[PDB]
Design an enzyme around this catalytic site. Structure first.
Site, PDB file in Angstrom:
ATOM      1  N   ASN A 192     -14.112 -33.013   8.308  1.00 59.19           N
ATOM      2  CA  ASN A 192     -14.486 -34.151   7.424  1.00 59.19           C
ATOM      3  C   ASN A 192     -15.538 -35.026   8.113  1.00 59.19           C
ATOM      4  O   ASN A 192     -15.414 -36.274   8.048  1.00 59.19           O
ATOM      5  CB  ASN A 192     -13.276 -35.000   7.030  1.00 59.19           C
ATOM      6  CG  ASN A 192     -12.136 -34.188   6.453  1.00 59.19           C
ATOM      7  OD1 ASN A 192     -12.348 -33.366   5.560  1.00 59.19           O
ATOM      8  ND2 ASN A 192     -10.929 -34.403   6.959  1.00 59.19           N
ATOM      9  N   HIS A 235       1.072 -34.798   6.963  1.00 60.35           N
ATOM     10  CA  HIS A 235      -0.106 -33.921   6.814  1.00 60.35           C
ATOM     11  C   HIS A 235       0.349 -32.493   6.501  1.00 60.35           C
ATOM     12  O   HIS A 235      -0.062 -31.940   5.466  1.00 60.35           O
ATOM     13  CB  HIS A 235      -0.911 -33.981   8.108  1.00 60.35           C
ATOM     14  CG  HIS A 235      -2.375 -33.777   7.934  1.00 60.35           C
ATOM     15  ND1 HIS A 235      -2.983 -32.539   8.138  1.00 60.35           N
ATOM     16  CD2 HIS A 235      -3.358 -34.652   7.629  1.00 60.35           C
ATOM     17  CE1 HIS A 235      -4.280 -32.662   7.960  1.00 60.35           C
ATOM     18  NE2 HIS A 235      -4.539 -33.946   7.642  1.00 60.35           N
ATOM     19  N   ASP A 273       0.112 -27.053  11.479  1.00 60.00           N
ATOM     20  CA  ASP A 273      -0.146 -28.461  11.096  1.00 60.00           C
ATOM     21  C   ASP A 273       0.848 -29.327  11.866  1.00 60.00           C
ATOM     22  O   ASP A 273       1.111 -28.991  13.013  1.00 60.00           O
ATOM     23  CB  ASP A 273      -0.103 -28.569   9.567  1.00 60.00           C
ATOM     24  CG  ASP A 273      -1.034 -29.618   8.998  1.00 60.00           C
ATOM     25  OD1 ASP A 273      -1.354 -30.586   9.733  1.00 60.00           O
ATOM     26  OD2 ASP A 273      -1.447 -29.450   7.825  1.00 60.00           O
ATOM     27  N   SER A 310      -9.143 -30.523   4.923  1.00 55.30           N
ATOM     28  CA  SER A 310      -7.739 -30.195   5.255  1.00 55.30           C
ATOM     29  C   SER A 310      -6.926 -29.864   4.003  1.00 55.30           C
ATOM     30  O   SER A 310      -5.860 -29.265   4.168  1.00 55.30           O
ATOM     31  CB  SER A 310      -7.104 -31.332   5.968  1.00 55.30           C
ATOM     32  OG  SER A 310      -5.701 -31.306   5.745  1.00 55.30           O
TER      33      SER A 310
HETATM   34 CA   LIG Z   1      -2.632 -32.757   4.210  1.00 57.81          CA
END
Ligand SMILES: [Ca+2]
Ligand SMILES: [Ca+2]
Length: 279
Positions: free
Chosen positions: A161, A69, A39, A224
């Site tokens: 997404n 994130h 990430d 995610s």
């Molecule tokens: Ca996240």
């Protein structure tokens, strides 16, 4: 072990039904298993990781998560309050810059780094990788996720997404890894969630409360955030000796809450990630 007034996502994966807010889980809690979050990195110094998180590799100036994130995804994996596997080791691999983007060459290096680096980590219980990232189809990225998976690491990837079929996204389209769609608290498929035969499982994805940078907390939605849930669950299920890296995905899909979700396209699996824990 019961965690009252837990985020809805945790509560849901310990539940046959929606609407409960207590997260039930074996007190082992993924101890001795390792989840590699690939990430933007991890703020390891967040009181929520209790020292169990560390940055193990970056491809940028700093291993620090300037984006969040990754810290948020790591949180949902193994943070004390928000994590599924409250006792798992989290290994940050920063393949994404603080703008949350990353070249496909870098990402691929990161997946391959994990495949190797796990041989440098103590994970008797087994290794997980949480790829809460994605983008356009790329057989190269697909192959990298396959390799990681083959290497003896359970790989959980976001469906994406795009509210489109995940066949057209990588590593989401890779057959061999656990492609995760997203659900909301009312068991609906999250509007944004990618679908299609390639999906293996859903996970809580909409309004997921988890750790954030500056030792803070915030809710964010996306496949995610489903992924860390399933990655987490795989770390919890491997530590319980209930599955292995190779078969975790299958085992999660077999033991999932079936037919529960609404707005699931015909030919997408109607499976919600369940820990199938009985207190
Ligand atoms: Ca996240
Ligand atoms: Ca909540």
């Amino acid at each position: 072990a019961a965690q009252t007034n837990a985020p809805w996502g945790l509560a849901r994966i310990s539940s046959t039904s929606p609407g409960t807010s207590t997260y039930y889980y074996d007190e082992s809690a993924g101890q001795g298993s390792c989840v590699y979050v690939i990430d933007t990195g991890i703020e390891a110094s967040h009181p929520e990781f209790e020292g169990r998180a560390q940055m193990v590799k970056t491809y940028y100036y700093s291993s620090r998560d300037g984006n969040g994130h990754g810290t948020h995804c790591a949180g949902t994996v193994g943070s004390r309050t928000y994590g599924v596997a409250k006792k798992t080791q989290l290994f940050g691999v920063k393949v994404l810059d603080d703008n949350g983007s990353g070249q496909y060459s870098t990402i691929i290096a990161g997946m391959d780094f994990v495949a190797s680096d796990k041989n440098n980590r103590n994970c008797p219980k087994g290794v997980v990788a949480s790829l809460s990232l994605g983008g356009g189809y790329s057989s190269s990225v697909n192959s990298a996720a396959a390799r990681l998976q083959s290497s003896g690491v359970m790989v959980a990837v976001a469906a994406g997404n795009n509210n489109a079929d995940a066949r057209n996204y990588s590593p989401a389209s890779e057959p061999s890894v656990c492609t995760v769609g997203a659900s909301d608290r009312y068991d609906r498929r999250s509007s944004f969630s990618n679908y299609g035969s390639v999906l293996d499982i859903f996970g809580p994805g909409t309004s997921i409360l988890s750790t954030w940078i500056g030792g803070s907390t915030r809710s964010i939605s996306g496949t995610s955030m489903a992924t860390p849930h399933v990655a987490g669950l795989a770390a919890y299920l491997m530590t319980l000796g209930k599955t292995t890296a190779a078969s975790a995905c299958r085992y999660i899909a077999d033991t999932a809450n079936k037919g529960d979700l609404s707005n699931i396209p015909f030919g997408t699996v109607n499976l919600l990630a369940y820990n199938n824990y009985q207190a």
